[PDB]
Design a protein around this ligand. Structure first.
Ligand SMILES: [Ca+2]
Ligand SMILES: [Ca+2]
Ligand SMILES: [Mg+2]
Ligand SMILES: [Mg+2]
Ligand SMILES: [Mg+2]
Ligand SMILES: [Mg+2]
Ligand SMILES: [Mg+2]
Ligand SMILES: [Mg+2]
Ligand SMILES: [Mg+2]
Ligand SMILES: [Mg+2]
Ligand SMILES: [Mg+2]
Ligand SMILES: [Mg+2]
Ligand SMILES: [Mg+2]
Ligand SMILES: [Mg+2]
Ligand SMILES: [Mg+2]
Ligand SMILES: [Mg+2]
Ligand SMILES: [Mg+2]
Ligand SMILES: [Mg+2]
Ligand SMILES: [Mg+2]
Ligand SMILES: [Mg+2]
Ligand SMILES: [Mg+2]
Ligand SMILES: [Mg+2]
Ligand SMILES: [Mg+2]
Ligand SMILES: [Mg+2]
Ligand SMILES: [Mg+2]
Ligand SMILES: [Mg+2]
Ligand SMILES: [Mg+2]
Ligand SMILES: [Mg+2]
Ligand SMILES: [Mg+2]
Ligand SMILES: [Mg+2]
Ligand SMILES: [Mg+2]
Ligand SMILES: [Mg+2]
Ligand SMILES: [Mg+2]
Ligand SMILES: [Mg+2]
Ligand SMILES: [Mg+2]
Ligand SMILES: [Mg+2]
Ligand SMILES: [Mg+2]
Ligand SMILES: [Mg+2]
Ligand SMILES: [Mg+2]
Ligand SMILES: [Mg+2]
Ligand SMILES: [Mg+2]
Ligand SMILES: [Mg+2]
Ligand SMILES: [Mg+2]
Ligand SMILES: [Mg+2]
Ligand SMILES: [Mg+2]
Ligand SMILES: [Mg+2]
Ligand SMILES: [Mg+2]
Ligand SMILES: [Mg+2]
Ligand SMILES: [Mg+2]
Ligand SMILES: [Mg+2]
Ligand SMILES: [Mg+2]
Ligand SMILES: [Mg+2]
Ligand SMILES: [Mg+2]
Ligand SMILES: [Mg+2]
Ligand SMILES: [Mg+2]
Ligand SMILES: [Mg+2]
Ligand SMILES: [Mg+2]
Ligand SMILES: [Mg+2]
Ligand SMILES: [Mg+2]
Ligand SMILES: [Mg+2]
Ligand SMILES: [Mg+2]
Ligand SMILES: [Mg+2]
Ligand SMILES: [Mg+2]
Ligand SMILES: [Mg+2]
Ligand SMILES: [Mg+2]
Ligand SMILES: [Mg+2]
Ligand SMILES: [Mg+2]
Lengths: 110, 196, 63, 137, 117
RNA sequence: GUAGGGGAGCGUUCAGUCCGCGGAGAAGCCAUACCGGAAGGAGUGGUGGAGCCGACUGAAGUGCGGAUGCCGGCAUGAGU
RNA sequence: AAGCUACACCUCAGAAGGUGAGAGUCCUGUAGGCGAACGAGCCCUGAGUAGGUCGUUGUUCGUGAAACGAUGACUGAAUCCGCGCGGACCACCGCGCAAGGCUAAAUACUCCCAGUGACCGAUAGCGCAUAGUACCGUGAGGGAAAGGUGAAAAGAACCCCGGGAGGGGAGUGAAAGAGAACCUGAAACCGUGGACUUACAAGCAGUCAUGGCACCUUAUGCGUGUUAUGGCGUGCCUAUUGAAGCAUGAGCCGGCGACUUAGACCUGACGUGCGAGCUUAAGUUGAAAAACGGAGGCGGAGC
RNA sequence: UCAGGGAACUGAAACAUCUCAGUACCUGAAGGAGAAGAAAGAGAAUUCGAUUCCGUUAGUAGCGGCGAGCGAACCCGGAU
């Protein structure tokens, strides 16, 4: 099945952005972007994570071991914010030097 | 009869409509003709034989003890070859001219029970923006509890609302015994085609 | 399409009239003839009867 | 009008014969009879002994005139009609042929029609009523 | 448009199969013997209904002369003598009168015999 | 009442329009003693887990018990 | 949550796809706008000939009264008061200049790409949800079946019986009534349990009648299941004068499987439009739609 | 697409002419197309005006064991 790139293989955000989730259990919760894989539309943000029962043996250890770990989301979270939640986003209109197409919403830069 | 117009004039006008209580008979046959004429003929299926992709002669006409059979490409086989399948074809046919002109006249006529708004110009839309077309229509009882068909002449004026879920545009000419009959009302506008 | 069977045309079977199928009268062609003088004459123009439907579609366009 | 409530004229569409498809009618053998040369088909209008072969009297050509019987011609009210006005006013469809008139009940008033040729007895009843007829000189 | 057989054929077959209750063997489980058994069963249902009319006829009669002869006359010289007693005409299932009230069937015996004298 | 002609219809897919229904659960499947003159159609329950019924019109790859029919699965012979 | 609801908003943009279930206003997009260095793209005028005889042949041309073009064999002209044709042939009257060459466009097709569909949706659709593979053949050549965890791998740490395989718990998850022999899961077929039954019985396997024993969710009845016993009772189809036939076919169940399509074609029934008149074809222009187009076709005169 | 070769089942209710059909097949040459093309023409109006394609003429004129069956062109309307 071809996947992820119905969104023209583009991300609506960057590797280090602060972002908020709207979706399911994690709606309204916030975190820094950590992994952004664009062609599978995956995103990892701090505090979304869960208990991966881990390799029963011999990952240099005899016994296995549960441990909490990051669990990525489809770009079902909603992206950059500044006016303090939600936020659509439009502006790509030249910072200083006039070259970088910075971001904005109904307000200022991101 | 002769319903009131809007901005340009406000005259009466009703043409001698074909109104014997406009039978569903002629109207139905025109609609069927149109839905038939527009149909594409794109339904290929593989012929019993050679269009299907298989072989030869299979084995023993007599004496194997298995049933008779000849090749792997026949409808009795679960292999290939539809016997009497669709093949591409056309359904369009010249319906007689008198009946389609009678049809659209009857269609316009069917809306003189309760329907058919102004044929005249009535365009106070700010060049071309939908919210202002919605206001124009909203002053005419076109609040959109009823789907409505618009016909006119100015790309600037139909462009106002190609979007709205109730209305759909068509230019002058290109009217449809089906379209005006399938929307719940007709904004006839364009007074030129309306009067002769 | 649809041919006429040209075996119908200059052969007997005129199509003509109120839709009925005339044909000729046959025996003593130009095969030999002593025989009667009132039969050698009575071989002009007949007209068949319960076969016409077959004859017509031989030649429904009246060639 | 309601497309739900459109209805074709009763009796203007009848259903196809579905041959096969039950012992509720047209069982087993289809419309067909049982054995015999009735099966995957061929052979036409031919009896396969001797097909009533009658003899052939023959002459190849023909060419026939276009007709204008003058019974419509008298109620016409418009008179003195040259016939190239007539093909381009009504009647006389044929462009490839030549025109002729003929006697049909009466003639009555005067007229003057320029047809390609006509029956001699039209001149017996067109000349009476003070009318000319032009054979095309 | 293709229009495969799906859902139609199973529904038909299941209705036939469900007509088969305690049918023996593959009469209850294979469609083809279930349906075929039902053809012959049609034959039997109709014929039998008509016949059941005539069968209770027979049971009727066979009780009535047993009681009659208990009183010393046969069926023949009894249903005669009620009809010859004319207005006596009760006819339908005299069986039950003979089978439950004998005080009554004795009186009907006396009536028939009086009519034949 | 056989071939055969005639009449009125039931069900399947697709299309147009309507009326709507669906995670408080759809189609499909499963049971059933209700209904219609038949093809059939509903009620309720169990299963399922994402689509779908009813009405009117239109178009058909539209209705299987057979064809030593096809594909597939599974039996009998036999614990031989 | 995208559904319900309540209040808003854009619309030259309500085409579409994704997103934990159905989103105009969340994402990709859409209408519209812009858009690069190199990038692709409209006195003469034809001789081994013309013409002829023999064999043949092409167009409607089957040796027919058979012209004309065409060469295989043998022959073989004339110049502008001249040369070829006009269906044996002749005269007249007409049409045209052979034996030198080139020539775009309207036409065809579909390996390849895009869009669309009263096209399929896993026995369908291409043979292939990919494979000319596996497999068969010395070869030429023939030739399969093909699918689905969950929204997300969070893909089951740890414990228990077992060499394992397999399972039972604990966890995760809405669901493990999804666990990787992973959507639904019919039927034939195999079993385990229960009710009612069956070890002197003769049986197309039912049907109708009545007693017995269970049961009570369209359901305490004219019930439902199952029994005992009586009466009656020769599978189905085909093919046939005549089939239970010791005549054909068939192990069973599932799915595939047979009166169609085409054409300005004929001939009827029914229905609609216009009616002494009715109608277009190819095409042109417009297409979220259809108008135009009389060439031509059918009536109207028959023998 | 053009060319050099060129079948037979079949239909004719048998089969020789005939049909199937210059179809299948083989071979040669070429391209995005190709062929054809600029009148010793069509044809009967002293009309026309290179070629190709479509409609119609018309299943008409004709061909034919005058059997089965095969089947033009001109005029006219279009694409160019
Ligand atoms: Ca043993
Ligand atoms: Ca044994
Ligand atoms: Mg065998
Ligand atoms: Mg196939
Ligand atoms: Mg049809
Ligand atoms: Mg005649
Ligand atoms: Mg039909
Ligand atoms: Mg019938
Ligand atoms: Mg038979
Ligand atoms: Mg056959
Ligand atoms: Mg024939
Ligand atoms: Mg004979
Ligand atoms: Mg005419
Ligand atoms: Mg019986
Ligand atoms: Mg009695
Ligand atoms: Mg539910
Ligand atoms: Mg049901
Ligand atoms: Mg779901
Ligand atoms: Mg079929
Ligand atoms: Mg049968
Ligand atoms: Mg079978
Ligand atoms: Mg098998
Ligand atoms: Mg959506
Ligand atoms: Mg909302
Ligand atoms: Mg020269
Ligand atoms: Mg020569
Ligand atoms: Mg010669
Ligand atoms: Mg000959
Ligand atoms: Mg000559
Ligand atoms: Mg020559
Ligand atoms: Mg001549
Ligand atoms: Mg489908
Ligand atoms: Mg397949
Ligand atoms: Mg399969
Ligand atoms: Mg293959
Ligand atoms: Mg090998
Ligand atoms: Mg090999
Ligand atoms: Mg999945
Ligand atoms: Mg295991
Ligand atoms: Mg284990
Ligand atoms: Mg839990
Ligand atoms: Mg389980
Ligand atoms: Mg499951
Ligand atoms: Mg396992
Ligand atoms: Mg699912
Ligand atoms: Mg499963
Ligand atoms: Mg057990
Ligand atoms: Mg048991
Ligand atoms: Mg014993
Ligand atoms: Mg016993
Ligand atoms: Mg025994
Ligand atoms: Mg019994
Ligand atoms: Mg016999
Ligand atoms: Mg018998
Ligand atoms: Mg036997
Ligand atoms: Mg047998
Ligand atoms: Mg036999
Ligand atoms: Mg056998
Ligand atoms: Mg026609
Ligand atoms: Mg044609
Ligand atoms: Mg032969
Ligand atoms: Mg033959
Ligand atoms: Mg031959
Ligand atoms: Mg070919
Ligand atoms: Mg080649
Ligand atoms: Mg080459
Ligand atoms: Mg032309």
């Amino acid at each position: 099945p071809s996947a992820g790139s119905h969104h023209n293989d583009k991300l609506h955000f960057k590797k280090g952005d602060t972002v908020i989730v709207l979706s399911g259990k994690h709606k309204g919760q916030t975190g820094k972007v950590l992994l952004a894989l664009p062609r599978d539309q995956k995103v990892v943000v701090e505090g979304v994570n869960v208990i991966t029962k881990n390799v029963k043996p011999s990952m240099t250890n005899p016994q296995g071991g549960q441990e909490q770990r990051e669990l990525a989301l489809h770009a079902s979270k909603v992206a950059l914010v500044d006016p303090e939640t939600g936020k659509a986003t439009r502006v790509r209109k030249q910072i200083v030097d006039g070259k970088k197409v910075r971001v904005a919403v109904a307000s200022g830069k991101t | 009869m002769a319903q009131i117009n809007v901005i340009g004039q406000n005259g009466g006008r009703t043409i001698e409509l074909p109104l014997p209580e406009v039978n569903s008979g002629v109207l139905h046959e025109v609609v069927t003709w149109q839905l038939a004429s527009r149909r594409r003929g794109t339904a290929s299926t593989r012929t019993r034989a050679q269009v299907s992709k298989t072989g030869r002669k299979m084995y023993g006409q007599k004496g194997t003890g298995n049933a008779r059979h000849g090749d792997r490409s026949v409808p009795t086989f679960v292999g290939g070859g539809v016997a009497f399948g669709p093949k591409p074809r056309s359904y369009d046919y010249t319906l007689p001219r008198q009946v389609r002109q009678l049809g659209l006249a009857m269609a316009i006529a069917s809306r003189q029970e309760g329907g058919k708004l102004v044929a005249v110009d009535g365009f106070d839309i700010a060049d071309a923006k939908t919210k202002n077309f919605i206001s124009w229509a909203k002053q005419n009882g076109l609040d959109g509890t009823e789907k409505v068909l618009l016909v006119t002449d100015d790309e600037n004026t139909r462009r106002a609302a190609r979007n709205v879920s109730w209305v759909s545009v068509l230019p002058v000419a290109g009217v449809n015994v089906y379209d005006i009959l399938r929307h719940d009302r007709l904004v006839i506008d364009a007074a030129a085609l309306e009067i002769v | 399409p649809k041919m006429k069977t040209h075996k119908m045309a200059k052969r007997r079977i005129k199509i003509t009239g109120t839709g009925k199928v005339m044909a000729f009268k046959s025996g003593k062609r130009h095969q030999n003839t002593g025989k009667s003088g009132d039969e050698i004459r009575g071989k002009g123009k007949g007209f068949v009867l319960a076969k016409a439907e077959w004859a017509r579609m031989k030649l429904m366009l009246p060639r | 009008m309601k497309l739900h409530d459109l209805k074709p004229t009763p009796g203007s569409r009848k259903d196809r014969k579905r041959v096969g498809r039950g012992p509720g009618g047209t069982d087993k053998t289809a419309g067909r009879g049982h054995k015999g040369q009735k099966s995957r088909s061929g052979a036409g209008k031919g009896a396969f002994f001797e097909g009533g072969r009658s003899r052939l009297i023959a002459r190849l050509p023909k060419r026939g005139f276009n007709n204008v019987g003058t019974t419509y011609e008298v109620v016409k009210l418009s008179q003195l009609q040259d016939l190239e006005d007539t093909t381009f006013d009504r009647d006389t469809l044929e462009a490839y042929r030549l025109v002729r008139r003929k006697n049909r009940p009466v003639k009555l008033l005067a007229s003057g029609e320029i047809s390609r040729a006509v029956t001699v007895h039209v001149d017996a009843a067109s000349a009476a009523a003070i009318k000319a007829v032009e054979a095309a000189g | 448009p293709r229009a495969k057989t799906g859902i139609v054929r199973r529904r038909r077959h299941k209705k036939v199969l469900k007509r088969a209750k305690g049918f023996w063997g593959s009469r209850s489980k294979q469609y083809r013997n279930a349906f075929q058994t039902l053809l012959n069963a049609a034959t039997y249902e109709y014929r039998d209904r008509r016949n059941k009319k005539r069968d209770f006829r027979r049971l009727w009669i066979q009780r009535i002369n047993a009681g009659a002869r208990l009183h010393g006359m046969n069926y023949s010289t009894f249903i005669n003598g009620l009809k010859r007693a004319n207005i006596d005409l009760n006819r339908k299932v005299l069986a039950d009168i003979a089978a439950r009230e004998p005080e009554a069937f004795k009186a009907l015996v006396d009536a028939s015999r009086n009519a034949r004298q």
